[PDB]
Enzyme design. Structure first.
Site, PDB file in Angstrom:
ATOM      1  N   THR A   1       0.845  -1.230   0.000  1.00  0.00           N
ATOM      2  CA  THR A   1       0.000   0.000   0.000  1.00  0.00           C
ATOM      3  C   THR A   1       0.865   1.260   0.000  1.00  0.00           C
ATOM      4  OG1 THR A   1      -1.782  -1.164   1.182  1.00  0.00           O
ATOM      5  CG2 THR A   1      -1.879   1.246   1.166  1.00  0.00           C
ATOM      6  N   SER A   2       0.560   2.169  -0.921  1.00  0.00           N
ATOM      7  CA  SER A   2       1.218   3.468  -0.995  1.00  0.00           C
ATOM      8  C   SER A   2       0.165   4.568  -1.084  1.00  0.00           C
ATOM      9  CB  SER A   2       2.161   3.527  -2.197  1.00  0.00           C
ATOM     10  OG  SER A   2       3.173   2.542  -2.100  1.00  0.00           O
TER      11      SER A   2
END
Ligand SMILES: *[C@@H](CS(C)(=O)=O)[C@H](Cc1ccc(CN)cc1)NC(=O)[C@H](CC(C)C)NC(=O)[C@H](CC(C)C)NC(=O)[C@H](Cc1ccccc1)N=[N+]=[N-]
EC number: 3.4.25.1
Lengths: 196, 222, 243, 250, 244, 244, 233, 204
Positions: free
Chosen positions: A1-2
């Site tokens: 996740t970014s």
């Protein structure tokens, strides 16, 4: 996740990848991590999908009830409701939430809420597993009061690098622009951002 | 288990295998994994079979009561919200992994719910032990704007992939088509590619083979 | 024996006097209100009376914004009105959280009517001396008017009226729909539907209105809103250029 | 705050009469006439939609309600008290039966559950009895077709045909003359429209009259196809057009 | 507060009587007459249906005679709804005993427990008592055939022949006149029908106004059998006894 | 019949709650208090009846602060007024805990309104014998409110309740007409002192003490503060000048 | 009139009065007289104790709440025990949690709020005792008068009970004299003894009859009884 | 450690032509130690039969529970429970104890009184219904029973032939299990009559 949210001249833009993984397997490559809690207040979700979805649904319920009684809530108010759930249930939750909303008086605001349940008001915030790889890049490239064009490029270049190095991140880059004009949805495909 | 869900131009279709297992042992060779929440909202179960059955029947019961209270057709978002909030409450102890699909006054929907309460939305989804075998076929043949017949064929091919390649899946293919304007059609045993061949010998014992010690008639009538 | 008129228990005639007296409390404010349905909108007009000069006119209101879609106008005392308003807002937010979609106008009406029924049966809770008119543009039923009373009774309306001079407005609307043969106001814009409701308010009551004498609430697709004094003024200029 | 009415509001009088029950039955007598007739292959329940205002839509107020796909109910008396009982009856059909046996309760048992709720409103602290009488018509596999009448006291009795409300005395007398143990469903519907006409003062059409039947299974009202054992609901509410067609053969 | 509307259901009179108990017994004295008679080879339960119509379905009807256990049955006089509440709890207590000891509950224990519940509403709670009088017909391997009665006070007694409901004084005099200790069930069936027919407030005693039940240990079985008489079976025995 | 005024939650034949109206009589008997909304704030003033020379001057404070921006003043049963402020202080703290921002005045007004209305729904509770004038400065301007025993409240340009409410309302109405542009915080303190002194003629038998408080955006930074020292005496002298 | 609205405290009268509260105030006027008075350094309580018989003891009137706070009672003694015990806990809570001596003004607010809760709820009765609270905090000496109605007032001098008007009129006249008695506890006590003697009618204040308490600048709250009050008679 | 392996025992059910059969062993043990050779695992409530395996204390408890529930059912419904309805009753009763389950493997066998249709059903410890048309097995030798039934079974067997099939499937499966055996009993269920037969087998 970014995930990341950046304030600028006209408001604030939220950015996210679309990958949710169960180990090495990508269960969903087209996930929407940018969640609406109010008309012009949105959030970025990281950590447990079940935890973040449940928290976001409760906040959306609280702000809807707030609007019925007291009118449009502030971004600080929305961040406080998120914080109250994250801090009080810190032993049972794994949630990293960035709260970003537009106000007519306060312009664009960003509040990051890490694992412990603390609140941090910042000009811009980065979170998720892929954010560690772009701490150096974002600190050197961030400027205050950028244009819409500049901010989109800043987030697009930052998340592309975050996706490149982090295995947990990937898919498409989703963006939500929050200004006085309204709410705009943006999407960028692998064939574009990978070659930046 | 192997379960899938595919959306087409005017609705959504879900498919499943028919193998129930107790570890390495097949308990039911032809079980129904396609459950009904409401007349036009159907569910496919994966994981703990008793958990998937009970969570579908509990929400299905509450959906029926909600429908009679509101005088409206059940919505897929309602079934989704009630299932996720129930599963989140038990911290994933109720091991129910579901693909929920259906048509309502708002349109066609397809969701997937995990035991912990997390939900996803897409045009094609897969769950179970043969989820990866099914997804591989879905990622190779899926296109936007499929017809009813194309969607049935794609979903059926995805289940077959789970049947042949995954050990936790086998036997028959069950299909349920849900079109926006029409009634939902449940196709029990849509394909039967696993019929057991005729045995080489009949094992019918001659009468009087088993030794008996005592014999009596049981009273049933009160 | 004579306490059958004090608590919500049956009288020898099979009546409930505390419910009947709660109906009498609804006309304490001396305010008349009407509701009409457009082609894709729903409009509520209510009388705005500010007797004391020391009052802030902007705070004097009997129309409430329950949710994004649903609005409610109340006939009766303001403390009981705000009690029903807060509850309706709480029920609306809870429904959305639990069932994933916005609560319909008729469902909220049924819920509030069920609560009113409880006060009719249980002794310790007194009935609220208010009549609630819920209005919205439902995503399934379209323009909707649903009205609840202290008895716990609720029903849908093509158009409705509430207040001391209710019957005069009711018969005025009745005669129009007998003439038009349709169950709504055949008009595209909500502005003219507001204009219709004000015109028939004047015809029935026999009284002219200024911009501060009226209170308007308009319900459209995905939004309910209330008109300001200047929005009503613009609506009063338009009806003046017809008579 | 807190309910301090922990004592009964219905008590025995010196004569042995339970006042609040008697007065609740009086409220039923003031209510609009509703009737029920049991035929050989079905049951019919009917009532008048007494519109309180011509501006009010009579369709949005259903006096006849579905409890289970095979069981329906109608009332005479207080409307609001009926609506909450329907909600409780629908829920008790699931909680006390369907979530246990995987099937819907038989007519006699669901009636027994409704009667229990109404009995408790007579004895429990700080409540008044329900000001309604109910006519519950249903079908189950082992009992066939049945019709029951539930009173404010919580007492229930099976009927071949009966009426409750305003002209219940005059309606029952007419039903005694026309009823036989060989009536078909269509005959029972015909008598139902004949008996209800005598009670109706004003307009007598499909828009002012509410009627529903418990008869054959309806596969077109099921909503899905594929399962052979599931054949559809037996409860069916007649539309405004379906009533008007049978009123021409009156 | 709420003290104003309190009827005080559980208070003594200046004479030492319980108002609500006395008024509940007055309520039952108007309900249909139920008679129980014990014989040497069984027990007979008979009941007169209060208020009947031509369109009243009798085949599916059951208002006075209820089955609690495979060995115990009851006759009801008073409020039918109030009875079913107590009847349901009695069925549960019977099954609780069977689950605990693996034996059928002795008749008296079931009667005493129901009477204790009736007693509870007499001393505490502030609620009205149950306006119901029961006649218990039952069998156990200790006392054999047993006949009990219980009323709103919570008091129970054993009987050879007893009547509850309307015209009890007239019915009890008729029973005390024609009862003998060596009676047969067929004789007890006849006595019950004769006593009811003489105490009937209506014109004639017909089958559609009667409920009948017998608890006999069938000689060609060795087990106790309960027999709730069908409308036709009541119609038959009405003709044989000489009532027609 | 009669007796509708004995119980709290009971509706009278004409749809009135007499116990609430009886609570209003306790307010009307009480001391006079006022509130004036100015151009950027609010000013609260109250009469303090000196019973005897034994009362320590400037000690028995009547005006109360909720949070740090809301001021409250009430007439009637003083203990009832304190109970309402205690609830309001809990209600304000609950809002700030969840939403971070201090509670808006219209938001706070409803919270007291719902709480007072709640005491008219049951016969186990008594209505409040106080009319509370309250307000302050929030996100968007200043607000003034007056709350009734019924739970009814409205926004006010000028509020008055107590013994001399009629004399006060007459003086407040003169200010609204003569100042359509808006009175200033400095002028409102002086004028509030005059109105109390003029409304004191309804209780001219006893000597009194003046107490003034204010919450202005430019004068007190939107925080509730008491008028003390030189500004208090300046207001007293302005009132003593125009009383003759 | 009065008979219909005096059943319980929860009911208002047509004039807007609470008769159950007013009846509770009548219990004070039946009780024995007690006098409170203060200067800028000290605060004194002088209480007249009442005996049932000549064989009975003179019931105590003054209760110590803390090292800096105390009160005298008039009316129902067990109601004074409940309210003093509550005030003992509130003084104790402030010292344990905040290391802070509870302000006399705030102590009056707590007694006001506790007595109010008994006047609005059904089932409860009003307290049947009047209290005179003295104390020396960070703002000097204080004297408070508590009433069952909930009303608490800060005063220089006061008296409650039977014939208490005689003492109250005296203190209102001697006001300018006893307020200046600073640094002399003996003269302030004598001023209270002269005050309580104005309420005398039946007998004269004796050794086992008189009860005096004092708190001040360098004086912890101490109660004098019997032999210790002999030099003031 | 495993509560399904303390006592031992097996239950098998089979359908035939207008008939059903249910069989169980008689062994009650405590680990390696044999305790009783009379512990019957098949019970009946009216015409519906139920065979329970696993922990013996739960086998006894459930039997007392379902006797309790079918008796109250019969008093309310005024009729005997059906195999399909009883199956749902067992399922809901077991799931009621989801997080504190009875360590059992129940097996329902019977013929519907109204339709005349043969019916068998199986359950796990938490109430999942296994409704097979052929056979249902349960117990410590379930693997052995699965292998026996899959081989020996053929559809539409007559009551006399079905007896031979189920008895040989039970006997040979029990002999390969240490915790099963010590006598056996077979029920042959028809629409009108039910025959109970005790089998002669190894006692080791
Ligand atoms: C496929 C799921 S998977 C995990 O991807 O292989 C099937 C799904 C299924 C869904 C619905 C139905 C209709 N009723 C049938 C089948 N799942 C299974 O086969 C599971 C696999 C488990 C999770 C390993 N097996 C079962 O649920 C079986 C049921 C049999 C008796 C029919 N039961 C179990 O394995 C129980 C698990 C358990 C153990 C302890 C506590 C709670 C549960 N064990 N047993 N017995």
């Amino acid at each position: 996740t970014s995930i990341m949210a950046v304030t600028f001249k006209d408001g604030v833009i939220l950015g996210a990848d679309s990958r949710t993984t169960t180990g090495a397997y990508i269960a969903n490559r087209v996930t929407d991590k940018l969640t609406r809690v109010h008309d012009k207040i949105w959030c970025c979700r990281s950590g447990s999908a079940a935890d973040t979805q449940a928290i976001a649904d409760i906040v959306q319920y609280h702000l809807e009830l707030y609007t019925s009684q007291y009118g449009t809530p502030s971004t600080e108010t929305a961040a406080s409701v998120f914080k109250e759930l994250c801090y009080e249930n810190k032993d049972n939750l794994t949630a990293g939430i960035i709260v970003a909303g537009y106000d007519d008086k306060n312009k664009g605001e960003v509040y990051t809420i890490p694992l412990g349940g603390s609140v941090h008001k910042l000009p811009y915030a980065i979170a998720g597993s892929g954010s560690t790889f772009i701490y150096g890049y974002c600190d050197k490239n961030f400027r205050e009061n950028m244009s819409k064009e500049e901010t989109v490029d800043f987030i697009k270049h930052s998340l592309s690098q975050a996706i490149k190095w982090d295995g947990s991140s990937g898919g498409v880059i989703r963006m939500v622009v929050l200004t006085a004009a309204g709410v705009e949805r943006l999407i960028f495909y692998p064939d574009e951002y990978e070659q930046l | 288990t192997t379960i899938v869900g595919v959306k087409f131009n005017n609705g959504v279709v879900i498919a499943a295998d028919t193998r129930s297992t107790q570890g390495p042992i097949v308990a039911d060779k032809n079980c129904a994994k396609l459950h009904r929440i409401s007349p036009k909202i159907w569910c496919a179960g994966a994981g703990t079979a008793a958990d998937t059955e009970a969570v579908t029947q509990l929400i299905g019961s509450n959906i029926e009561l909600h429908s009679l209270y509101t005088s409206r057709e059940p919505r897929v978002v309602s079934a989704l919200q009630m299932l996720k909030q129930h599963l989140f409450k038990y911290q994933g102890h109720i091991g129910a992994y579901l693909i929920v699909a259906g048509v309502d006054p708002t349109g066609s929907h397809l969701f997937s719910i995990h035991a912990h309460g997390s939900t996803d939305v897409g045009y094609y989804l897969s769950l179970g032990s043969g989820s990866l075998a099914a997804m591989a076929v879905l990622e190779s043949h899926w296109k936007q704007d499929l017809t009813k017949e194309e969607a049935i064929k794609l979903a059926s091919d995805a289940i077959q992939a789970g049947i042949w390649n995954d050990l936790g899946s086998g036997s028959n293919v069950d299909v349920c088509v849900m079109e926006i304007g029409k009634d939902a059609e449940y196709l029990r045993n849509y394909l039967t590619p696993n019929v057991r061949e005729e045995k080489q010998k009949s094992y019918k014992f001659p009468r009087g083979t088993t030794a008996v010690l005592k014999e009596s008639i049981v009273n049933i009538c009160d | 024996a004579g306490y059958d008129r004090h608590i919500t228990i049956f009288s020898p005639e099979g009546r409930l006097y505390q419910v009947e007296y709660a109906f009498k409390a609804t006309n304490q404010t001396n305010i008349n209100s009407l509701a009409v349905r457009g082609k894709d909108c729903t409009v509520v007009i209510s009388q705005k009376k500010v007797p004391d000069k020391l009052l802030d006119p902007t705070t004097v209101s009997y129309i409430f914004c329950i949710s994004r879609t649903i609005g409610m106008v109340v006939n009766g005392p303001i403390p009981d009105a705000r009690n029903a308003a807060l509850r309706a807002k709480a029920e609306a937010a809870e429904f959305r959280y639990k069932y994933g979609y916005d609560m319909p106008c008729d469902v909220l009406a049924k819920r509030m009517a069920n609560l009113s029924q409880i006060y009719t049966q249980r002794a310790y809770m007194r009935p609220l001396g208010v009549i609630l008119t819920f209005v919205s543009v439902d995503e399934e039923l379209g323009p909707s008017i649903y009205k609840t009373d202290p008895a716990g009774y609720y029903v849908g309306y093509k158009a409705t009226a509430t207040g001391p001079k209710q019957q005069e407005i009711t018969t005025n609307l009745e005669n129009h729909f007998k003439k038009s043969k349709i169950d709504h106001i055949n008009e595209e814009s909500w502005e003219k539907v507001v204009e219709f409701a004000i015109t028939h308010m004047i015809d029935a009551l026999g009284t002219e209105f200024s911009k501060n004498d009226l209170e308007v609430g308009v319900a459209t697709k995905d939004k309910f809103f209330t008109l300001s004094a200047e929005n009503i003024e613009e609506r009063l200029v338009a009806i003046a250029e017809q008579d | 705050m807190t309910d301090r009415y922990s004592f009964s509001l219905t008590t025995f009088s010196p004569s042995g009469k339970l006042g609040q029950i008697d007065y609740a039955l009086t409220a039923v007598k003031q209510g609009v006439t509703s009737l029920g007739i049991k035929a050989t292959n079905g049951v019919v329940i009917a009532t008048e939609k007494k519109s309180s205002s011509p501006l009010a839509m009579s369709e949005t107020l259903s006096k006849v309600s579905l409890l289970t796909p095979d069981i329906g109910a109608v009332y005479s008396g207080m409307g609001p008290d009926y609506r909450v009982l329907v909600d409780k009856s629908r829920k008790v059909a699931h909680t006390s039966y369907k979530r246990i046996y995987g099937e819907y309760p038989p007519t006699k048992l669901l009636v027994s559950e409704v009667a229990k709720i109404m009995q408790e409103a007579t004895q429990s602290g700080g409540v008044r009895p329900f000001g309604v009488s109910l006519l519950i018509a249903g079908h189950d596999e082992f009992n066939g077709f049945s019709l029951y009448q539930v009173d404010p006291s919580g007492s229930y009795f099976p009927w071949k045909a009966t009426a409750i409300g305003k002209g219940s005395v005059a309606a029952k007398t007419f039903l005694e003359k026309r009823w036989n143990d060989e009536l078909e469903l269509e005959d029972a519907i015909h008598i139902a429209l004949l008996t209800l006409k005598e009670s109706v003062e004003g307009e007598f059409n499909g828009d002012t009259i509410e009627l529903a039947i418990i008869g054959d299974e309806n596969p077109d009202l099921l909503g899905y196809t594929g399962i052979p054992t599931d054949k559809g609901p037996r409860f069916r509410k007649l539309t405004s057009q379906e009533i008007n067609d049978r009123l021409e053969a009156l | 507060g709420s003290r104003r509307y309190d009827s005080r259901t559980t208070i003594f009179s200046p004479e030492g009587r319980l108002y609500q108990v006395e008024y509940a017994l007055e309520s039952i004295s108007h309900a249909g007459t139920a008679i129980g008679i014990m014989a040497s080879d069984g027990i007979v339960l008979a009941a007169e249906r209060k208020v009947t119509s031509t369109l009243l379905e009798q085949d599916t009807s059951t208002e006075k005679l209820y089955k609690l256990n495979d060995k115990i049955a009851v006759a009801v006089a008073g409020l039918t709804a109030d009875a079913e509440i107590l009847i349901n709890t009695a069925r549960i207590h019977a099954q609780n005993y069977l689950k605990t000891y693996n034996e059928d509950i002795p008749v008296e224990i079931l009667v005493r427990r129901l009477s204790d519940i009736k007693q509870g509403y007499t001393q505490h709670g502030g609620l009205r008592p149950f306006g119901v009088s029961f006649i218990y017909a039952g069998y156990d391997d200790r006392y054999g055939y047993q006949l009990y009665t219980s009323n709103p006070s919570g008091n129970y007694t054993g009987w050879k022949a007893i009547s509850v409901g309307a015209n009890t004084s007239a019915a009890q005099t008729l029973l005390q006149m024609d009862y003998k200790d060596d009676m047969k069930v067929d004789d007890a069936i006849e006595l019950a029908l004769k006593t009811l027919s003489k105490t009937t407030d209506s014109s004639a005693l017909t089958y559609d106004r009667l409920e009948f039940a017998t608890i006999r240990k069938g000689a060609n079985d060795g087990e106790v059998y309960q027999k709730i008489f069908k409308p036709q079976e009541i119609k038959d025995i009405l003709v044989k006894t000489g009532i027609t | 019949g009669t007796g509708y005024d004995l119980s709290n939650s009971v509706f009278s034949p004409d749809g009135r709650n007499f116990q609430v109206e009886y609570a209003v009589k306790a307010v009307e008997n009480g001391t006079t208090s006022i509130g004036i909304k100015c151009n950027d704030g609010v000013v609260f003033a109250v009469e303090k009846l000196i019973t005897s020379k034994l009362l320590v001057p400037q000690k028995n404070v009547k005006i109360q602060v909720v949070d740090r921006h809301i001021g409250c003043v009430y007439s009637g049963l003083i203990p009832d007024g304190r109970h309402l402020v205690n609830r309001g202080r809990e209600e304000a703290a609950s809002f700030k805990k969840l939403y971070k921002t201090p509670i808006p005045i219209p938001a706070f007004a409803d919270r007291l309104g719902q709480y007072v209305q709640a005491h008219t729904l049951y016969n186990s509770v008594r209505p409040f014998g106080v009319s509370t004038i309250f307000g302050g400065v929030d996100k968007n301007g200043a607000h003034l409110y007056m709350l009734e025993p019924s739970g009814s409240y409205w926004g006010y340009k000028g509020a008055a309740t107590g013994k001399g409410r009629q004399s006060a309302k007459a003086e407040l109405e003169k200010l609204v007409d003569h100042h359509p542009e808006g009175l200033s915080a400095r002028e409102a303190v002086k004028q509030a002192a005059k109105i109390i002194y003029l409304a004191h003629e309804d209780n001219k038998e006893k000597d009194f003490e003046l107490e003034i408080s204010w919450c202005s955006l430019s004068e007190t930074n939107g925080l509730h503060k008491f008028v003390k020292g030189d500004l208090l005496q300046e207001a007293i002298d302005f009132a003593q000048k125009e009383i003759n | 009139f009065r008979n219909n609205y005096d059943g319980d405290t929860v009911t208002f009268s047509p004039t807007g009065r609470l008769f159950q509260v007013e009846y509770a105030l009548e219990a004070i006027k039946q009780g024995s007289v007690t006098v409170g008075l203060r200067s800028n350094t000290h605060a004194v309580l002088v209480a007249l104790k009442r005996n049932a018989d000549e064989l009975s003891s003179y019931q105590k009137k003054i209760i110590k709440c803390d090292e800096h706070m105390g009160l005298s009672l008039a009316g129902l003694a067990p109601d004074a025990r409940v309210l003093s015990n509550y005030l003992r806990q509130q003084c104790n809570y402030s010292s344990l949690v905040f290391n802070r001596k509870l302000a006399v003004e705030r102590a009056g607010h707590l007694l006001c709020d506790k007595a109010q809760k008994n006047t609005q709820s059904y089932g409860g009765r009003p307290y049947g005792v009047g209290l005179l609270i003295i104390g020396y905090d960070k703002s000097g000496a204080h004297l408070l008068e508590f009433q069952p109605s909930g009303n608490v007032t800060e005063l220089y001098g006061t008296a409650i009970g039977a014939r208490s008007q005689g003492a109250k009129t005296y203190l209102e006249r001697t006001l300018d004299t006893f307020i200046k008695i600073d640094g002399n506890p003996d003269e302030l006590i004598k001023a209270g003894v002269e005050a309580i003697s104005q309420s005398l009618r039946d007998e004269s204040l004796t050794v086992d009859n008189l009860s005096i308490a004092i708190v001040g600048k360098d004086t912890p709250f101490t109660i004098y009884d019997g032999e210790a009050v002999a030099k003031y008679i | 450690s495993d509560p399904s392996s303390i006592n031992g025992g097996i239950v098998v059910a089979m359908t035939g032509k207008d008939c059903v059969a249910i069989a169980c062993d008689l062994r009650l043990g405590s680990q390696s130690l044999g305790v009783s050779n009379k512990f019957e695992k098949i019970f009946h409530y009216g015409h519906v039969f139920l065979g329970i395996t696993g922990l013996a204390t739960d086998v006894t408890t459930l039997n007392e529970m379902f006797r309790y529930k079918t008796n109250l059912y019969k008093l309310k419904e005024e009729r005997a429970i059906e195999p399909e309805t009883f199956t749902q009753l067992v399922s809901s009763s077991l799931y009621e104890r989801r997080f504190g389950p009875y360590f059992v493997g129940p097996v329902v066998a019977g013929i519907n009184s109204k339709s005349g249709k043969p019916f068998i059903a199986g359950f796990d410890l938490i109430g999942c219904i296994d409704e097979a048309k052929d056979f249902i097995v349960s117990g410590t030798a379930s693997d052995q029973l699965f292998g026996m039934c899959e081989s020996l079974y053929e559809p539409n067997l007559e009551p006399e032939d079905l007896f031979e099939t189920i008895s040989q499937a039970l006997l040979n499966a029990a002999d390969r299990d240490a915790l099963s055996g010590w006598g056996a009993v077979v029920y042959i269920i028809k629409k009108d009559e039910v025959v109970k037969r005790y089998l002669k087998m190894r006692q080791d």
